[PDB]
Design a protein around this ligand. Structure first.
Ligand SMILES: CCNC(=S)N/N=C/c1ccc(O)c(O)c1
Ligand SMILES: [Cl-]
Ligand SMILES: [Zn+2]
Length: 315
């Protein structure tokens, strides 16, 4: 007896493609690698309960290739399989609402992802790929599983792998519209004189070396090619936020002087992030856990500040 069911294949879970599948053959024999809500069903034969359901496939024809690129803005061949593999895990995570924000209950070393997600909800940022637009909208509403699996896929991290918050924000910023952001800097060495520099996009909102936006405005010391120590300071800034980063160090966070921050405790090989947000007081969100304090000191690695337009008074 020949037996078939109708199913739909997709790469973006919006555009559906009608298929008829033989129940005597595996999905892999018929579609190549195949996934059902993240589960790998390549080696599985169709079940009666599968009729009418949507399965993800790899982009193996030109129509799927165009749909996949338009939705995800990547042509990495392993992207979809990495996204599905992550999703099969992230759909089992818990996304509690903590002080009004979507967080993530700790699992699989996902603290870096929770603090990135909490941070995104406090800064003005729009994603360009529709996949990130759609999943971030759901994540804000509390259903963050697709968004978290997408972050992992875009950052080329697997579930359980130790991640860096600054690196993760850099990847997400790459897929965001920061084209309006502009940064002017000035560097003065007493032997080589001055050199001004202009930065755009992601490089205009991120800085590595100091956590303090004020010290960045007043000036910081850096090496020069002559061996002398030059000074770098901020001349002009156009952006809705800025991100200041440094190797973790004991740092004091004062209520009302920043938006949010990341704390990192541990070592290079493994550790733990927490999130600090300045609202009516200072709240520390550690996954599902919440505590408060009026003052905060701890090993901070990233701090986020609000911005609109800033111009220096330094002559
Ligand atoms: C450079 C040729 N690729 C094109 S034209 N479209 N491909 C899009 C795409 C997205 C994710 C994937 O995993 C994948 O295999 C493909
Ligand atoms: Cl968005
Ligand atoms: Zn010099």
């Amino acid at each position: 007896e020949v037996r078939t069911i109708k199913v739909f294949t997709t790469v973006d879970n919006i555009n559906l493609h009608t298929q008829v599948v033989d129940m005597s053959m595996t999905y892999g024999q018929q579609f190549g690698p195949t996934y059902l809500d993240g589960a790998d069903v390549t080696k599985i034969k169709p079940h009666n309960s599968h009729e009418g359901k949507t399965f993800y496939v790899l982009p193996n024809d030109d129509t799927l290739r165009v749909e996949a690129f338009e939705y995800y803005h990547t042509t990495d061949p392993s992207f979809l399989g990495r996204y599905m593999s992550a999703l099969n895990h992230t759909k089992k995570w818990k996304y509690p609402q903590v002080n009004g924000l979507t967080s993530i209950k700790w699992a699989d070393n996902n603290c870096y992802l929770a603090t990135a997600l909490l941070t995104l909800q406090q800064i003005e940022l729009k994603f360009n790929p529709p996949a990130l637009q759609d999943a971030y909208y759901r994540a804000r509403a509390g259903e963050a599983a697709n968004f978290c699996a997408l972050i992992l896929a875009y950052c080329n991290k697997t579930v359980g792998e130790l991640g860096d918050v600054r690196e993760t924000m850099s990847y997400l910023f790459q897929h965001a519209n920061l084209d309006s952001c502009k940064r002017v800097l000035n560097v003065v060495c007493k032997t080589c004189g001055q050199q001004q520099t202009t930065l755009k996009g992601v490089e205009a909102v991120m800085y590595m070396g100091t956590l303090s936006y004020e010290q960045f405005k007043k000036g910081v010391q850096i090496p020069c090619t002559c061996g002398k120590q030059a000074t770098k300071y901020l001349v002009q800034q156009e952006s809705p936020f800025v991100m200041m980063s440094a190797p973790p160090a004991q740092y004091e966070l004062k209520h009302g002087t920043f938006t949010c921050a990341s704390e990192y405790t541990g070592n290079y090989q493994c550790g733990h992030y927490k999130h600090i947000t300045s609202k009516e007081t200072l709240y520390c969100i550690d996954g599902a856990l919440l505590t408060k304090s009026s003052e905060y000191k701890g090993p901070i690695t990233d701090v986020f500040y609000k911005e609109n337009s800033y111009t220096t008074t330094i002559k």
